[model samples]
Target: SKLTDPLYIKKICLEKVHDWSRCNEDDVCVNQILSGLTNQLFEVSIKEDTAIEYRITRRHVLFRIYPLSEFEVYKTMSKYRIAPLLLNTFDGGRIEEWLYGDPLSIDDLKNKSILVGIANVLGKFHTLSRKRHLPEHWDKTPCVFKMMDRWRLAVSNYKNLDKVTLDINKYIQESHKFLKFIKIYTQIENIANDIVFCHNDLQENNIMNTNKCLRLIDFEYSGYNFLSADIANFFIETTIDYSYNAYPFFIINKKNYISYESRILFVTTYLSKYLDDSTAADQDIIDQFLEAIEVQALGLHLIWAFWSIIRGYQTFDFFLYAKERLKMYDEQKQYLMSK
Candidate 1:
């Protein structure tokens, strides 16, 4: 019903564009564009009868999933030319510039140039000023500790693992040691530098590949997060998929998964075009860069693990995704600790 309700959508669309004569009720077309897990996206197209224009010039947007200021985030990002343009903001949602482009799939990452382009866009995002733009809910503290606190709270709330599947319970049990590792490691050296406005969620679905370039979307979970967390989240999320399998099932396409070499190349490309650029001769800087990525990679696994647990209670197969992400965290934690 929310998707099919034309009147509600029309009112949201006509907030700033006050032209009742531009298009009749029959000339306006509103359809739900199914995409992300959080909010329902609608594609609003209006065709006036004067010349019978059929091009897409209107969009009815809604974002109530997160507590952060999604409208301001889009406005700032549009100012930086990384996200779609925002036209106007109303009580609940805002109308945005309709992007006629194909959303990138996991298979698209095979191209090295695409990865470099993504890294460059992320670099541009990280360099933007965050003085008066970010939301009040933005966590200025280090994301590692902030998210770790949330993870612990999520785990403690689960009285028992009886409701969860067997594999999920086992992985959650195994996460104990990894959790301890995270606590100790964060105390040691949590690379909480250059806290900038990050997209936070950068899966393939959030990226759009227009014929001309790539544009990032979906800023629900975005805020003042660590630079490494944003980068590592993209790397981790690119490999996640729950749609290809049955319910309560998840599979990591290893073939399409980003490799260590690819990670290195991506961050290297990012550093080159970022703030001041860099070189391999700066071994200390390079080491810190790699270290930040690894640390955040671990933190991300736990963050998503808990998030998946919460999502598992729903209809989707987020439980399985959580299990797999926890498994990766367990394995990666051991490897990082060993190294």
Candidate 2:
């Protein structure tokens, strides 16, 4: 029943788009473009408009239906154009302008031009807290820490958690250790390493290639987090290929971690963009903090590891995915600690 009728879709469009009220339900065109586990996207448009149409009357809007925050975060981001606007909302889902682009493929993550665009946007995104339009309570603690704590509480009670993570007690212990490291490792002496709004999920798929510019989507995970961990999260994501024709629906290729030389180039761009609205003291601390980015990978690894477990182990085998991340977190933390 929730699979909305075309006639119903047309009526909603009529109430929202003003001029659309002039058209009959049969005059509208609707097509389902994508279907995911909890969401579906339908492209809605006018099959043909009446001739008094000087604005070309050519329009296509996206009606997204999802059993799903993402909206609140996105609404905030819209003020700064950090993400696309949410045109309107209903109990089930939303309506918005159609973003014409492709969700980034894993290979697209390595292209320098595309990568630089990503770096710039991320740099700009993290500085949003400085603008301070949000209520203080929503950001009382850093978002990354908040999310990790929240997620862990839920998964700890998950009945089959042991199957998802080989050693639950060890996993819990190591997780607490990792969070502390995220704090100290990201801080440098004296300059303000304050938290900022972050796109906590910037994996390749959430990044879109518009050909004209890259667009960041899916704000359900956006929040205030340490800059280094956000970047570390992005770097950790580059190692993953999520479109696999297999059980877990992913491939973790460690070699694809952004090269040191490439990391430098990417960070330089990110810092410059960030500094546009930041102070110089902030500059001195961040300019030489590349290693902090590397250290935060453990946080990203654990965050996703716990996330996969709570997401359940259906056809995608979220448990196996959690297993892979926990294993990598162990390996990478050792590698990072030695240096």
Candidate 3:
């Protein structure tokens, strides 16, 4: 899909989205554009910044035109009027008029209701139907597969170890192996086949909790995947850097660390709502889910670390984010060691 091409998107958007911020104006756009090891995502112009925004390409189209007719179904299915549409695209990638409200930070999520609300929004995405025959590529494997792949590739890139790479590689390698053990060491569970429509990336930045009601954005990675992966991604992404600066009110001096407790809370709450199907299993699935969070958090830490190493600290916001994730991995590793 053209959406996965980073270089292509950088060149295209430089000409488009003329009002792109100074950060976007610089090569940072190109860096971040092509940087994603998995998907092709570009931060968009905010809602107020544009009007009747449209995104189309020679291959496919999004926004500005309804292609899938799924939006209508979602509107009716979920008893709501204003729909945050997920426009279909076979050739083109995501093109969204950025949402209102600044991205929430760690502390921003401390409003327990907001935290639960965002979790519920993810639960909604998890319960959404995955019966659509959108694309074979989308249904290929579990969501953790991508995170695992990214971790492996990132560690490989750090083989030479220029300090940052060395530290991150060691951390990611140790962290990723734990998850690999679950899939390899133990017997496979029925949960593997329990697929659902999901927002593959549900980090704080992707959510806009506006006017007391939480709204989600960035559906580029939206599609079918194991529900556990969404929960896994949600916790890993948010706590990766573990910085509380962006969320002064909520995080309250939170540092760069993660406990198995926090990891458990995120995954347990996520699964109780979505993955509690009447399948043949005990608490083993829950055990597996929590273990994966620790594993994936470590993997995410390495991924973010490597990305930060190459991208440089130019974007201080995300740099701290990666550092915090690394810090969390350290804590998680220590937790496992004591156990």
Q: State how far residue 146 of model 1 sits from its true place (Å).
A: 1.9
Per-model C-alpha lDDT, please? Answer: 0.66, 0.73, 0.49
lDDT of 1: 0.66
Worst 10 residues of 3 by lDDT: 59-68
Estimate the lDDT of model 2: 0.73
After superposition, the stretches of candidate 2 with alpha carbons farther than 4 Å from their true spots are: 1-4, 35-38, 48-58, 190-192, 281-288, 313-315
How do the residues 183-272 of candidate 1 rate in per-residue lDDT, one tens digit apiece?
565453433346677788877778888884888988767677677878877777667664465665455864556877877888878876
RMSD of each: 4.1, 3.2, 10.0
Instruction: Sort the predicted structures by lDDT, highest score first.
Output: 2, 1, 3
Could you tell me which residue pairs clash in candidate 1? none
Best by lDDT: 2
Collision count of model 3: 7
Per-residue accuracy of model 3 over 1-339 as CA lDDT, tens digit each:
443544455445444443333223223232233223334444433232222232222211122211113333343323332235443332355343344455666656545556566666666556656423333444545545564565456546543344443465565566557557646632445453355665666677667656767776555455555655566566655433333335411231335333455545655565566554773456576676566455445444555455554454322444444555567667756765675
Better structure of 1 and 3 per lDDT = 1
TM-score against truth, every candidate: 0.81, 0.87, 0.57
Ten residues in sequence with the least summed lDDT for candidate 1: 57-66
